[PDB]
mmCIF file of C-alpha atoms in Angstrom:
data_model
loop_
_atom_site.group_PDB
_atom_site.id
_atom_site.type_symbol
_atom_site.label_atom_id
_atom_site.label_comp_id
_atom_site.label_asym_id
_atom_site.label_seq_id
_atom_site.Cartn_x
_atom_site.Cartn_y
_atom_site.Cartn_z
ATOM 1 C CA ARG A 1 0.000 0.000 0.000
ATOM 2 C CA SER A 2 1.039 3.665 0.234
ATOM 3 C CA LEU A 3 2.063 3.157 3.895
ATOM 4 C CA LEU A 4 5.011 0.974 2.839
ATOM 5 C CA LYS A 5 7.565 3.062 4.722
ATOM 6 C CA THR A 6 5.915 3.058 8.166
ATOM 7 C CA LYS A 7 5.563 -0.728 7.943
ATOM 8 C CA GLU A 8 9.274 -1.241 8.618
ATOM 9 C CA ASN A 9 8.617 -0.514 12.287
ATOM 10 C CA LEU A 10 4.851 -0.683 12.699
ATOM 11 C CA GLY A 11 2.140 -3.209 11.893
ATOM 12 C CA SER A 12 3.865 -5.674 9.551
ATOM 13 C CA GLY A 13 7.295 -4.681 10.883
ATOM 14 C CA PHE A 14 6.450 -6.105 14.317
ATOM 15 C CA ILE A 15 6.462 -9.642 12.885
ATOM 16 C CA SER A 16 10.210 -9.584 12.112
ATOM 17 C CA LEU A 17 10.838 -8.244 15.640
ATOM 18 C CA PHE A 18 8.794 -10.999 17.316
ATOM 19 C CA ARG A 19 10.110 -13.864 15.142
ATOM 20 C CA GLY A 20 11.317 -16.703 17.362
ATOM 21 C CA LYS A 21 11.520 -14.507 20.472
ATOM 22 C CA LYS A 22 10.268 -15.310 23.973
ATOM 23 C CA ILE A 23 8.312 -12.830 26.140
ATOM 24 C CA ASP A 24 10.576 -11.079 28.686
ATOM 25 C CA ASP A 25 11.477 -7.477 29.626
ATOM 26 C CA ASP A 26 14.205 -7.659 26.975
ATOM 27 C CA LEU A 27 11.502 -8.031 24.337
ATOM 28 C CA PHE A 28 9.258 -5.215 25.649
ATOM 29 C CA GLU A 29 12.316 -2.948 25.636
ATOM 30 C CA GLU A 30 13.081 -3.830 22.018
ATOM 31 C CA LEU A 31 9.448 -3.051 21.119
ATOM 32 C CA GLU A 32 9.392 0.171 23.132
ATOM 33 C CA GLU A 33 12.420 1.349 21.156
ATOM 34 C CA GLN A 34 10.803 0.530 17.830
ATOM 35 C CA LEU A 35 7.673 2.437 18.859
ATOM 36 C CA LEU A 36 9.669 5.520 19.934
ATOM 37 C CA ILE A 37 11.684 5.553 16.718
ATOM 38 C CA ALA A 38 8.328 5.323 14.849
ATOM 39 C CA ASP A 39 7.163 8.451 16.687
ATOM 40 C CA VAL A 40 4.440 6.905 18.822
ATOM 41 C CA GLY A 41 5.694 9.038 21.689
ATOM 42 C CA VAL A 42 6.630 8.556 25.331
ATOM 43 C CA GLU A 43 3.128 8.606 26.871
ATOM 44 C CA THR A 44 1.400 6.561 24.171
ATOM 45 C CA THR A 45 4.261 4.037 24.132
ATOM 46 C CA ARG A 46 4.225 3.684 27.938
ATOM 47 C CA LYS A 47 0.463 3.059 27.710
ATOM 48 C CA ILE A 48 0.757 0.535 24.887
ATOM 49 C CA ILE A 49 3.546 -1.417 26.610
ATOM 50 C CA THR A 50 1.752 -1.752 29.961
ATOM 51 C CA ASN A 51 -1.583 -2.780 28.418
ATOM 52 C CA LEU A 52 0.299 -5.344 26.330
ATOM 53 C CA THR A 53 2.225 -6.700 29.328
ATOM 54 C CA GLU A 54 -0.942 -7.174 31.396
ATOM 55 C CA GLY A 55 -2.484 -8.846 28.347
ATOM 56 C CA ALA A 56 0.410 -11.136 27.448
ATOM 57 C CA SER A 57 0.683 -12.273 31.060
ATOM 58 C CA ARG A 58 -2.970 -12.803 31.948
ATOM 59 C CA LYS A 59 -3.331 -15.045 28.893
ATOM 60 C CA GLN A 60 -0.054 -16.775 29.758
ATOM 61 C CA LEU A 61 1.662 -15.952 26.454
ATOM 62 C CA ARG A 62 5.295 -17.071 26.458
ATOM 63 C CA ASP A 63 5.493 -16.693 22.692
ATOM 64 C CA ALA A 64 6.367 -13.279 21.241
ATOM 65 C CA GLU A 65 4.789 -13.834 17.811
ATOM 66 C CA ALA A 66 1.333 -13.625 19.435
ATOM 67 C CA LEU A 67 1.849 -9.969 20.397
ATOM 68 C CA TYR A 68 1.159 -8.906 16.817
ATOM 69 C CA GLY A 69 -2.554 -9.632 17.351
ATOM 70 C CA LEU A 70 -2.628 -7.896 20.725
ATOM 71 C CA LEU A 71 -0.816 -4.829 19.296
ATOM 72 C CA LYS A 72 -3.339 -4.743 16.447
ATOM 73 C CA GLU A 73 -6.035 -4.709 19.148
ATOM 74 C CA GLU A 74 -4.727 -1.892 21.410
ATOM 75 C CA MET A 75 -3.482 0.338 18.558
ATOM 76 C CA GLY A 76 -6.857 -0.233 16.882
ATOM 77 C CA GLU A 77 -8.664 1.006 19.970
ATOM 78 C CA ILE A 78 -6.521 4.140 20.027
ATOM 79 C CA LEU A 79 -7.499 5.055 16.467
ATOM 80 C CA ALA A 80 -11.101 3.959 16.942
ATOM 81 C CA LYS A 81 -11.634 6.634 19.575
ATOM 82 C CA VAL A 82 -11.006 9.342 16.976
ATOM 83 C CA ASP A 83 -12.843 7.700 14.047
ATOM 84 C CA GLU A 84 -15.663 10.249 13.676
ATOM 85 C CA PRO A 85 -16.117 11.302 10.007
ATOM 86 C CA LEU A 86 -16.733 14.907 8.980
ATOM 87 C CA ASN A 87 -20.372 15.464 7.934
ATOM 88 C CA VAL A 88 -20.705 18.833 6.165
ATOM 89 C CA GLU A 89 -24.394 18.631 5.183
ATOM 90 C CA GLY A 90 -27.515 20.574 6.142
ATOM 91 C CA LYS A 91 -25.990 24.005 6.774
ATOM 92 C CA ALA A 92 -25.893 27.199 4.723
ATOM 93 C CA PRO A 93 -23.037 27.404 4.709
ATOM 94 C CA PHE A 94 -21.192 24.838 6.791
ATOM 95 C CA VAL A 95 -18.140 26.813 7.894
ATOM 96 C CA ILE A 96 -14.844 25.007 8.149
ATOM 97 C CA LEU A 97 -12.100 27.058 9.838
ATOM 98 C CA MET A 98 -8.720 25.755 8.693
ATOM 99 C CA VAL A 99 -5.987 26.346 11.291
ATOM 100 C CA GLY A 100 -2.313 25.359 11.212
ATOM 101 C CA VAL A 101 1.258 26.407 10.381
ATOM 102 C CA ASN A 102 2.528 27.524 6.937
ATOM 103 C CA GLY A 103 3.977 24.914 4.566
ATOM 104 C CA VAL A 104 2.139 22.128 6.355
ATOM 105 C CA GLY A 105 -0.317 21.630 3.493
ATOM 106 C CA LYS A 106 -3.290 23.873 4.411
ATOM 107 C CA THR A 107 -3.823 25.647 1.087
ATOM 108 C CA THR A 108 -3.406 22.364 -0.753
ATOM 109 C CA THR A 109 -5.730 20.508 1.615
ATOM 110 C CA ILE A 110 -8.286 23.296 1.118
ATOM 111 C CA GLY A 111 -8.168 22.856 -2.646
ATOM 112 C CA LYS A 112 -8.472 19.068 -2.371
ATOM 113 C CA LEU A 113 -11.323 19.319 0.136
ATOM 114 C CA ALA A 114 -13.198 21.800 -2.055
ATOM 115 C CA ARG A 115 -12.945 19.484 -5.082
ATOM 116 C CA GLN A 116 -14.220 16.571 -2.984
ATOM 117 C CA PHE A 117 -17.297 18.457 -1.751
ATOM 118 C CA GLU A 118 -18.108 19.696 -5.240
ATOM 119 C CA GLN A 119 -17.643 16.103 -6.472
ATOM 120 C CA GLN A 120 -20.436 15.257 -4.022
ATOM 121 C CA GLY A 121 -22.878 17.827 -5.297
ATOM 122 C CA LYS A 122 -22.275 20.827 -3.066
ATOM 123 C CA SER A 123 -21.152 24.354 -3.894
ATOM 124 C CA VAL A 124 -18.064 25.582 -2.095
ATOM 125 C CA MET A 125 -16.687 29.027 -1.370
ATOM 126 C CA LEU A 126 -13.192 29.854 -0.132
ATOM 127 C CA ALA A 127 -12.036 32.642 2.141
ATOM 128 C CA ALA A 128 -8.381 33.768 2.188
ATOM 129 C CA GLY A 129 -8.085 34.581 5.909
ATOM 130 C CA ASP A 130 -4.286 34.276 5.874
ATOM 131 C CA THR A 131 -4.373 37.901 4.699
ATOM 132 C CA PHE A 132 -0.616 38.603 5.075
ATOM 133 C CA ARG A 133 0.672 35.491 3.277
ATOM 134 C CA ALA A 134 0.264 36.999 -0.205
ATOM 135 C CA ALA A 135 1.446 33.789 -1.903
ATOM 136 C CA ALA A 136 -1.341 31.726 -0.285
ATOM 137 C CA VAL A 137 -4.018 34.348 -1.035
ATOM 138 C CA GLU A 138 -2.846 34.427 -4.664
ATOM 139 C CA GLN A 139 -2.904 30.620 -4.833
ATOM 140 C CA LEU A 140 -6.493 30.249 -3.609
ATOM 141 C CA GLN A 141 -7.604 32.998 -5.997
ATOM 142 C CA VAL A 142 -6.103 31.868 -9.282
ATOM 143 C CA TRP A 143 -6.951 28.253 -8.451
ATOM 144 C CA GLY A 144 -10.497 29.072 -7.383
ATOM 145 C CA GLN A 145 -10.995 31.086 -10.546
ATOM 146 C CA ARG A 146 -9.904 28.279 -12.864
ATOM 147 C CA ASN A 147 -12.158 25.905 -10.871
ATOM 148 C CA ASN A 148 -15.109 28.287 -10.881
ATOM 149 C CA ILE A 149 -15.222 28.326 -7.096
ATOM 150 C CA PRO A 150 -15.792 31.783 -5.566
ATOM 151 C CA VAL A 151 -12.850 32.973 -3.453
ATOM 152 C CA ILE A 152 -13.373 35.843 -1.017
ATOM 153 C CA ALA A 153 -10.049 37.690 -0.761
ATOM 154 C CA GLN A 154 -9.139 41.219 0.328
ATOM 155 C CA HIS A 155 -6.112 43.509 0.453
ATOM 156 C CA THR A 156 -2.919 42.151 2.069
ATOM 157 C CA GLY A 157 -3.244 42.551 5.820
ATOM 158 C CA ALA A 158 -7.001 43.153 5.994
ATOM 159 C CA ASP A 159 -8.483 41.982 9.288
ATOM 160 C CA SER A 160 -8.755 38.188 8.935
ATOM 161 C CA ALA A 161 -12.078 38.018 10.858
ATOM 162 C CA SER A 162 -13.585 40.697 8.601
ATOM 163 C CA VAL A 163 -12.640 38.864 5.420
ATOM 164 C CA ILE A 164 -14.193 35.706 6.814
ATOM 165 C CA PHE A 165 -17.295 37.627 7.995
ATOM 166 C CA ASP A 166 -17.640 39.000 4.456
ATOM 167 C CA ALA A 167 -17.105 35.475 3.122
ATOM 168 C CA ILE A 168 -19.853 34.056 5.335
ATOM 169 C CA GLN A 169 -22.204 36.892 4.410
ATOM 170 C CA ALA A 170 -21.500 36.276 0.697
ATOM 171 C CA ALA A 171 -21.864 32.499 1.125
ATOM 172 C CA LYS A 172 -25.360 32.877 2.588
ATOM 173 C CA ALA A 173 -26.406 35.156 -0.270
ATOM 174 C CA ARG A 174 -25.047 32.852 -3.011
ATOM 175 C CA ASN A 175 -26.454 29.704 -1.366
ATOM 176 C CA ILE A 176 -23.102 28.023 -0.744
ATOM 177 C CA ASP A 177 -23.149 24.700 1.085
ATOM 178 C CA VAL A 178 -19.577 24.719 2.386
ATOM 179 C CA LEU A 179 -17.376 27.723 3.140
ATOM 180 C CA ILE A 180 -13.731 26.822 3.762
ATOM 181 C CA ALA A 181 -11.775 29.589 5.511
ATOM 182 C CA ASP A 182 -7.983 29.860 5.676
ATOM 183 C CA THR A 183 -6.197 31.442 8.689
ATOM 184 C CA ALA A 184 -2.751 32.747 9.638
ATOM 185 C CA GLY A 185 -0.509 30.207 11.322
ATOM 186 C CA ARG A 186 2.388 31.824 13.169
ATOM 187 C CA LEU A 187 3.309 30.102 16.431
ATOM 188 C CA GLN A 188 6.101 32.662 16.856
ATOM 189 C CA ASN A 189 3.521 34.822 18.645
ATOM 190 C CA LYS A 190 1.620 32.234 20.726
ATOM 191 C CA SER A 191 -1.029 34.399 22.435
ATOM 192 C CA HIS A 192 -1.493 36.610 19.364
ATOM 193 C CA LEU A 193 -2.584 33.566 17.410
ATOM 194 C CA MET A 194 -4.959 32.706 20.265
ATOM 195 C CA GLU A 195 -6.439 36.209 20.328
ATOM 196 C CA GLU A 196 -6.566 36.336 16.525
ATOM 197 C CA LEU A 197 -8.451 33.024 16.189
ATOM 198 C CA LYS A 198 -10.652 33.942 19.172
ATOM 199 C CA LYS A 199 -11.663 37.140 17.341
ATOM 200 C CA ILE A 200 -12.375 35.176 14.188
ATOM 201 C CA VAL A 201 -14.551 32.651 16.011
ATOM 202 C CA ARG A 202 -16.429 35.456 17.770
ATOM 203 C CA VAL A 203 -17.061 37.641 14.747
ATOM 204 C CA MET A 204 -18.623 34.552 13.099
ATOM 205 C CA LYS A 205 -21.392 34.482 15.708
ATOM 206 C CA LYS A 206 -22.770 37.760 14.357
ATOM 207 C CA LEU A 207 -24.128 35.883 11.362
ATOM 208 C CA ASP A 208 -24.528 32.372 12.780
ATOM 209 C CA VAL A 209 -24.232 31.169 16.403
ATOM 210 C CA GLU A 210 -23.170 27.753 15.124
ATOM 211 C CA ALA A 211 -20.202 28.874 13.029
ATOM 212 C CA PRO A 212 -17.629 27.634 12.819
ATOM 213 C CA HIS A 213 -19.171 24.190 12.397
ATOM 214 C CA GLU A 214 -15.663 22.762 12.072
ATOM 215 C CA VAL A 215 -12.224 23.933 13.299
ATOM 216 C CA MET A 216 -9.827 21.797 11.327
ATOM 217 C CA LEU A 217 -6.133 21.509 12.156
ATOM 218 C CA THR A 218 -3.836 20.373 9.337
ATOM 219 C CA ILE A 219 -0.504 18.865 10.351
ATOM 220 C CA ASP A 220 2.332 17.199 8.418
ATOM 221 C CA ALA A 221 3.015 13.578 9.393
ATOM 222 C CA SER A 222 6.561 13.765 8.036
ATOM 223 C CA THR A 223 7.520 16.325 10.679
ATOM 224 C CA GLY A 224 6.980 13.784 13.448
ATOM 225 C CA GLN A 225 7.114 15.438 16.869
ATOM 226 C CA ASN A 226 6.596 18.836 15.205
ATOM 227 C CA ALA A 227 3.115 17.678 14.273
ATOM 228 C CA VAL A 228 2.406 16.791 17.906
ATOM 229 C CA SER A 229 3.655 20.049 19.436
ATOM 230 C CA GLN A 230 1.698 22.017 16.826
ATOM 231 C CA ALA A 231 -1.447 20.081 17.723
ATOM 232 C CA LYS A 232 -0.916 20.753 21.425
ATOM 233 C CA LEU A 233 -0.419 24.471 20.643
ATOM 234 C CA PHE A 234 -3.614 24.800 18.569
ATOM 235 C CA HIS A 235 -5.491 22.610 21.012
ATOM 236 C CA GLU A 236 -4.916 25.241 23.673
ATOM 237 C CA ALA A 237 -5.610 28.180 21.346
ATOM 238 C CA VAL A 238 -8.888 27.099 19.779
ATOM 239 C CA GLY A 239 -11.588 24.466 20.035
ATOM 240 C CA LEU A 240 -10.295 21.947 17.501
ATOM 241 C CA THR A 241 -13.080 19.660 16.247
ATOM 242 C CA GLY A 242 -11.112 17.697 13.655
ATOM 243 C CA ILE A 243 -7.557 16.985 12.499
ATOM 244 C CA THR A 244 -6.094 16.226 9.073
ATOM 245 C CA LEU A 245 -2.806 14.276 8.756
ATOM 246 C CA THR A 246 -1.048 14.867 5.439
ATOM 247 C CA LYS A 247 2.074 13.326 3.829
ATOM 248 C CA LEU A 248 1.616 9.898 5.415
ATOM 249 C CA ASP A 249 3.105 8.227 2.362
ATOM 250 C CA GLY A 250 6.892 8.438 2.293
ATOM 251 C CA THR A 251 7.657 8.660 5.991
ATOM 252 C CA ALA A 252 8.669 5.975 8.489
ATOM 253 C CA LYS A 253 7.447 8.228 11.298
ATOM 254 C CA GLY A 254 3.850 7.164 10.622
ATOM 255 C CA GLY A 255 3.353 6.189 14.269
ATOM 256 C CA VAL A 256 2.656 9.847 14.954
ATOM 257 C CA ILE A 257 -1.009 9.192 14.056
ATOM 258 C CA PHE A 258 -1.262 7.241 17.328
ATOM 259 C CA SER A 259 0.424 10.013 19.309
ATOM 260 C CA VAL A 260 -1.940 12.709 17.975
ATOM 261 C CA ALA A 261 -4.955 10.453 18.517
ATOM 262 C CA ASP A 262 -4.196 9.267 22.036
ATOM 263 C CA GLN A 263 -2.905 12.539 23.473
ATOM 264 C CA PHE A 264 -5.646 14.875 22.231
ATOM 265 C CA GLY A 265 -8.635 12.711 21.336
ATOM 266 C CA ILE A 266 -9.811 15.100 18.616
ATOM 267 C CA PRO A 267 -11.390 13.283 15.605
ATOM 268 C CA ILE A 268 -8.977 12.566 12.756
ATOM 269 C CA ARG A 269 -11.065 13.653 9.773
ATOM 270 C CA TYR A 270 -8.773 13.105 6.797
ATOM 271 C CA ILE A 271 -5.575 11.210 6.202
ATOM 272 C CA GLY A 272 -3.304 12.153 3.301
ATOM 273 C CA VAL A 273 -1.788 9.054 1.728
ATOM 274 C CA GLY A 274 -0.791 10.534 -1.629
ATOM 275 C CA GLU A 275 -0.940 13.592 -3.885
ATOM 276 C CA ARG A 276 -4.222 12.976 -5.766
ATOM 277 C CA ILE A 277 -7.493 14.554 -4.621
ATOM 278 C CA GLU A 278 -8.811 11.083 -3.656
ATOM 279 C CA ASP A 279 -5.620 10.554 -1.683
ATOM 280 C CA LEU A 280 -6.945 12.903 0.973
ATOM 281 C CA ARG A 281 -8.780 9.889 2.365
ATOM 282 C CA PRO A 282 -11.589 10.280 4.918
ATOM 283 C CA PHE A 283 -10.173 8.540 7.999
ATOM 284 C CA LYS A 284 -11.498 5.074 8.873
ATOM 285 C CA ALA A 285 -9.633 3.494 11.817
ATOM 286 C CA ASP A 286 -10.262 -0.160 10.904
ATOM 287 C CA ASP A 287 -9.116 0.325 7.302
ATOM 288 C CA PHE A 288 -5.965 2.057 8.479
ATOM 289 C CA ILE A 289 -5.096 -0.615 11.032
ATOM 290 C CA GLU A 290 -5.842 -3.382 8.546
ATOM 291 C CA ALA A 291 -3.405 -1.891 6.071
ATOM 292 C CA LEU A 292 -0.821 -1.048 8.699
ATOM 293 C CA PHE A 293 -0.829 -4.629 9.899
ATOM 294 C CA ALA A 294 -1.408 -6.466 6.599
ATOM 295 C CA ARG A 295 1.558 -8.716 5.777
#
């Protein structure tokens, strides 16, 4: 599958580690190491190991090979807890606030997401709320134009929340089903980001007390621990309702999906396993685990 690189250490990769081995602390240490190198993280790895030890003992397993099935079980539960799909229907418009750092995929994810919704029969409108990042504003505009998707964009530096308020206002008038709004992502000024996003979320209430219907964080799987810290940061700034993991193909640090799931508990909406529009796959825990573990 596309997850071929993460499989060296996770899922299928466990088999080679367990081959012929007996169950002792030496083995759990070897596994712990593999999990940490895979970016599962200290806390999640400590949790996985203990659960697995209690399980391998209270079922009297002396054979290491059998841990593959028990790993599949506990890691499956971790992803299952954040397996709630994004349902963007019944609103006018359904506002998705896209938060996250620059160069993490946001603008690209926005384009892919818009194409997917339109492919389902719903009109989309974009809002360039990252008003200072002139490259990103430009990108959404030219792209939206050639895709016949209205893009609400204003002068460089205009108040983000105003652009988005105008975008929501316009969306309601033009009967748009989904409005996807971009935001500025500069962690360099922690509390400014918090106050900025807080203003955005508040100004929205003037036109709809339900907006935003979705606060989506986009993070890059290939940046391992960076993806986790970023999530923690945005988790404390805004009310994240969904997360999107991009660039899962091509990185052996794929275990980060378990770290971001276990530590925050926020629904993983989409998983990026390639560069095509269909590659921004709606996240299904069971399908992911099955492919992670498939020999």
